[PDB]
Design a protein around this nucleic acid. Structure first.
Ligand SMILES: [K+]
Ligand SMILES: [K+]
Ligand SMILES: [Mg+2]
Ligand SMILES: [Mg+2]
Lengths: 117, 65, 153, 116
RNA sequence: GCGGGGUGGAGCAGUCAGGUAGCUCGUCGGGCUCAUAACCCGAAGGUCGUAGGUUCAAAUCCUGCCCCCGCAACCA
RNA sequence: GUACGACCGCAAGGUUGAAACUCAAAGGAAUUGACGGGGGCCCGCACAAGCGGUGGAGCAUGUGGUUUAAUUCGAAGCAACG
RNA sequence: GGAGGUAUGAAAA
C-alpha cells in the first residue's frame, strides 16, 4: 500500500482503515449471530409448529449465504515477547578494568591506562 | 553493541522496555536516542577522552563538544 | 522540642589535622562508641587520598564537602487533603550534617573490600564532582527545583 | 511583525493564569499560560507559574518586537502581581496597570454554593 | 434429537488464531483499630471435565466418552 | 393532623376533625461534667530531626491455640504475655 | 463586648 505524506500520515491513514475494517466485520458478525439465533430457535421448536419450522429453513439459507460472504479479520501480527532474567546475582564489582591500554598493531593507541569499575 | 540495529521500530521499543527491567548489569552502546532513554542509563563513559560520568542530559554536552 | 532551640554540644579539633570537621567525620563513621577504630579508618583513608593524589587530604575532603553539601532541601507539608514537598534553604549546620551523612552512607555501600578504601574512593569522587554522594545532592536540588512553585510557603 | 506599544491582558483565575500580549487594538501578538508551560493541577494557580507564563509570553512579544505594554488585570487569581513583576524583569516597560474584573450590577444569578 | 457449557472456593477471561495458565470476589496468615468493618501487606488455591489422537509442543485443534442447563419428542 | 362524614380543588391536595389502642413519661429553662471530624493557649521521645532496633532467619522464654491422664492455678489493649 | 445582611458499638444493672 502506497500513501501520500509522511510516516505519521501513513499511521493515521492505516489505523483508520483497520478501524473502519474492524467495524465492518463486527456488523457482519452481528447479523450472522442474529440469523444463527433464530435458526436455533426454530431447530428446537416442536415439530408441530409447521410455520416456524418453515421459516427456520428459509433463514438457514440466508445464514449460509451470509457465512460465505463474511470477511475474515486479518490476524494481527504478533509482537516479540522477551523475558530476560539472570540465573545468578550481580556483585558490587562485576567488572574491574585497571590501567588498560590497547592499540591495533600499526595504529594509534585508542586509550591509555583506561580504568573503570 | 548497538542492539536496536536492524530491528523494526516496534521491536526496538520492546527491546528497550525489557532491558530497562533487566535485573543485571548492562554495558551498552547505542546511537539511537530513544533506546538509551528507555533503558535509563546510569553512568556514561565518553571516548576517546576517558570520562566515567553520571548519566544525564549532559550526554548532549559531550556530543556537542 | 517545644520549649525552643537547645544548646549544641561542641567538638574539639582533630588531633593530627587540627580540624573539627575531621572529628565530626570520625563521629559519623563511628559505631558502638568504637572511636579508636573510627579514627584509624579515617586516617587510613586520608593517607590513601594523599597517596593516590598529591593534594592534601584535608583540602580534598573539604572539596568533597563543598560538592556534596546541599543548598535547598524539600520538607513535606500536609496541606488539607493534599501532601506535597516544599523547598527550604539548608542552614549550614544541617548542610555539613547532610554532607557527612551522605558521604558515609554511600561509602559503606561501595564495593571495595575495606571501609577506609571505600571512604577514600568516595571522597575522591565527590571532590571530582562525581559519584553517589554528588548524585544524591543533584537529586535533592532537582526535587527542590521541581517543587519550586511552592517556595512561598 | 514590528510593534512598539501594546496591551497585556492577565487573566488570573483560582485554577489557571493566562497572559495575552496584544497590540493597542487588541489583536493578539503572543500569549502563554501556566498549563501551556507544563504546570498541571494545583500548580497552575501558583504565582510562580504565573511568573513563568508572563516571562515566556513577554519573550515571544519582545522577539516579535515590542517595548512598552499597559497591563489589564482580570480575575481573582493570586498570580497577578507575579506576572507583572515577570513582565518588568523580562524587559517590557509597564506603562500603566488597570483592573478590568467584570462587576455585574446584580445581573445574572451565579451558580449554587458548593457543598449543599 | 437440537443447542449451550465443563479453567482455583464462586463467577469469568484466555479457546477462534498451538508455546506463557490469568481477572474479580472469596479463603488463610500478618498488619491498622479499644473492637468490627473498610483499608494495607503476604500466601495458598487449578496440571483447564475425562480418555485417546495431531504436533517438537494441546486449556486451545480433532474424536469419543461422562456430567449440567434449555428445548423437542408430533401436527388435519 | 390519621379514619369517617362534610366542604373546597382540574389535580396535587387544603379546611374541619376523632376513636380504639399504647407508654409513664414527653417537655421548657438552666446547672455540673464528659464529648466535638468547635475555638484559644500550653506541655510530654508525642510528632518532627536523628541513632539503633522489632517484624524476615536459628535458638531462649512467655502467651494463645491444639493435644494430653494431667498438660495446676492466676494475669487479657494501653495498664496480660523473660 | 452584643444584633441583622453577606461506618458501626448486642440486653439488664
Ligand atoms: K529484624
Ligand atoms: K523477637
Ligand atoms: Mg520519628
Ligand atoms: Mg523474628
Amino acid at each position: 500500500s502506497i500513501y501520500e505524506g509522511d510516516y505519521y500520515t501513513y499511521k493515521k491513514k492505516y489505523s483508520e482503515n483497520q478501524l473502519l475494517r474492524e467495524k465492518m466485520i463486527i456488523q457482519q458478525e452481528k447479523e450472522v449471530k442474529e440469523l444463527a439465533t433464530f435458526v436455533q430457535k426454530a431447530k428446537q421448536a416442536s415439530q408441530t409448529n409447521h410455520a416456524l419450522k418453515r421459516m427456520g429453513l428459509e433463514r438457514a439459507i440466508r445464514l449460509d449465504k451470509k457465512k460465505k460472504n463474511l470477511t475474515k479479520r486479518d490476524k494481527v501480527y504478533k509482537r516479540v515477547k522477551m523475558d530476560i532474567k539472570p540465573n545468578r546475582e550481580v556483585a558490587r564489582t562485576p567488572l574491574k578494568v585497571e590501567n588498560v591500554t590497547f592499540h591495533y598493531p600499526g595504529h594509534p593507541i585508542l586509550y591509555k591506562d583506561l580504568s573503570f569499575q | 553493541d548497538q542492539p536496536t540495529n536492524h530491528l523494526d521500530p516496534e521491536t526496538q521499543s520492546i527491546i528497550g522496555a525489557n532491558f530497562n527491567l533487566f535485573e543485571g548489569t548492562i554495558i551498552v552502546v547505542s546511537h539511537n536516542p530513544s533506546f538509551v532513554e528507555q533503558i535509563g542509563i546510569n553512568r556514561m563513559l565518553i571516548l576517546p577522552s576517558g570520562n566515567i560520568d553520571n548519566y544525564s542530559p549532559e550526554l548532549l554536552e559531550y556530543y556537542s563538544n | 522540642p517545644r520549649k525552643g532551640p537547645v544548646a549544641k554540644r561542641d567538638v574539639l579539633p582533630d588531633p593530627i589535622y587540627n580540624s573539627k570537621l575531621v572529628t565530626r567525620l570520625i563521629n559519623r563513621v563511628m559505631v558502638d562508641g568504637k572511636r579508636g577504630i573510627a579514627a584509624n579508618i579515617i586516617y587510613n583513608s586520608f593517607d590513601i587520598i594523599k597517596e593516590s593524589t598529591g593534594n592534601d587530604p584535608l583540602e580534598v575532603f573539604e572539596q568533597a564537602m563543598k560538592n556534596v553539601m546541599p543548598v535547598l532541601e524539600v520538607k513535606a507539608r500536609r496541606v488539607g487533603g493534599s501532601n506535597y514537598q516544599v523547598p527550604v534553604e539548608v542552614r549550614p549546620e544541617r548542610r555539613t550534617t547532610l554532607g557527612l551523612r551522605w558521604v558515609v552512607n554511600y561509602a559503606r555501600l561501595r564495593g571495595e573490600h575495606t571501609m577506609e578504601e571505600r571512604l577514600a574512593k568516595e571522597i575522591m569522587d565527590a571532590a571530582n564532582n562525581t559519584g553517589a554522594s554528588v548524585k544524591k545532592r543533584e537529586d535533592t536540588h532537582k526535587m527542590a527545583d521541581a517543587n519550586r512553585a511552592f517556595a512561598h510557603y | 511583525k514590528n510593534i512598539e506599544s501594546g496591551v497585556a491582558h492577565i487573566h488570573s483565575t483560582f485554577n489557571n493564569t493566562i497572559v495575552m500580549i496584544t497590540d493597542t487594538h487588541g489583536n493578539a501578538l503572543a500569549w502563554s499560560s501556566a498549563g501551556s508551560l507544563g504546570f498541571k493541577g494545583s500548580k497552575k494557580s501558583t504565582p510562580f507559574a504565573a511568573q513563568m507564563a508572563a516571562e515566556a509570553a513577554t519573550k515571544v512579544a519582545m522577539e516579535h518586537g515590542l517595548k512598552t505594554v499597559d497591563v489589564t488585570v482580570k480575575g481573582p487569581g493570586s498570580g497577578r502581581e507575579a506576572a507583572i513583576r515577570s513582565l518588568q524583569a523580562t524587559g517590557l516597560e509597564v506603562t500603566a496597570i488597570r483592573d478590568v474584573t467584570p462587576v455585574p450590577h446584580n445581573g445574572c444569578r451565579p451558580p449554587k454554593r458548593r457543598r449543599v
